[PDB]
Amino acid sequence: NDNPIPKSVPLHPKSGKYFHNLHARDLSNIYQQCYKQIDETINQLVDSTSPSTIGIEEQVADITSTYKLLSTYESESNSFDEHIKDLKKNFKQSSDACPQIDLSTWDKYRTGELTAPKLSELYLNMPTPEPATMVNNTDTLKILKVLPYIWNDPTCVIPDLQNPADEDDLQIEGGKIELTCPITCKPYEAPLISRKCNHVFDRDGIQNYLQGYTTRDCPQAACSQVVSMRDFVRDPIMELRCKIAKMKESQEQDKRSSQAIDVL
Amino acid sequence: TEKIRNRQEKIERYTSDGTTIEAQIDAKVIYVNEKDSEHQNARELLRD
Amino acid sequence: MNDVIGFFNEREADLKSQYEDKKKFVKEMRDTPEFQSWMREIRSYDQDTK
């Protein structure tokens, strides 16, 4: 009507060139660089704070909030790109469905009696991104959450699935997790744990037990299962505990020696 | 008919080029991954 | 729109050609050999008036 400017027209092959050219610009490299940066910052912070200094809980909470915000950003960016591709597919299908303007179909579209899909309206009507079907649980997040307790004491039992207060009401009765293996009187240089056994092993003597037998029972108690080589994975918690224990024992030995010399 | 013939010949040539460039971009993916590993080695050497 | 304006240009060129053909038909409709045969039938009738 009036000025012959139709609201929308069917897609053209020349316009199809640009439609295929249009894409959402990526953040995969940016996101992975950010993730690696925050992970290495957490790793540095693990031993960065002075052993006598206490109160890393607020910094841990702040870093947890930062990581959660980053993960939410990544999830909604994935939502962005999937929405973009779905919108492109819907628009191309609608354009293919609609006819082509040759003689007066353009006039009909201009008069408004005929309508064609418009990417602007579709992008205005696309649903807002939703952080659904996404879980903010990573190994870095887990170690970040559990590191304050390890800092407080090397032996801790954080899970509260059985009871929110502790493992059993107020008393854990969980014993201690020893850095030095009775089998191998040495710190765990290769901490390997099973998703089923949930026990950390040095693997130096475990390979000797697992050679010649396809599956062998877990030597530790409180469980009964057989595992192979490929069920073992690296557990950062174990060497985190080892490092904090060594650092604390070094600082306490230095303090006691210095005070004893000050006595003389 | 000859327009369709040359169009489908171009389509077949483009599909062959797409397969070859898929192989080439897989080669480039391995190339960039190994270059990234070489950088990880180089950066750790610089660090130490 | 570039496609549709080219199409309308060729359509109006065809319309111009058809209009030229109609003008040629109008021109040949007059000054016919039968039109030449006329104006002397009038003379023949004028030789013998009323």
Added chain:
Amino acid sequence: QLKEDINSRQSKIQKYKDDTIYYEDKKKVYLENIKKIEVNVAALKEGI
């Protein structure tokens, strides 16, 4: 950039396939017109 370019080229290949499909449909319509002209010519020849 090569991955983006080859994805664009693959979409160009699929749109060429669609264009060839429409061209084949036009050719089929033309063949139907040719068959109608042929049967008309056959009837005219019969009268001849």
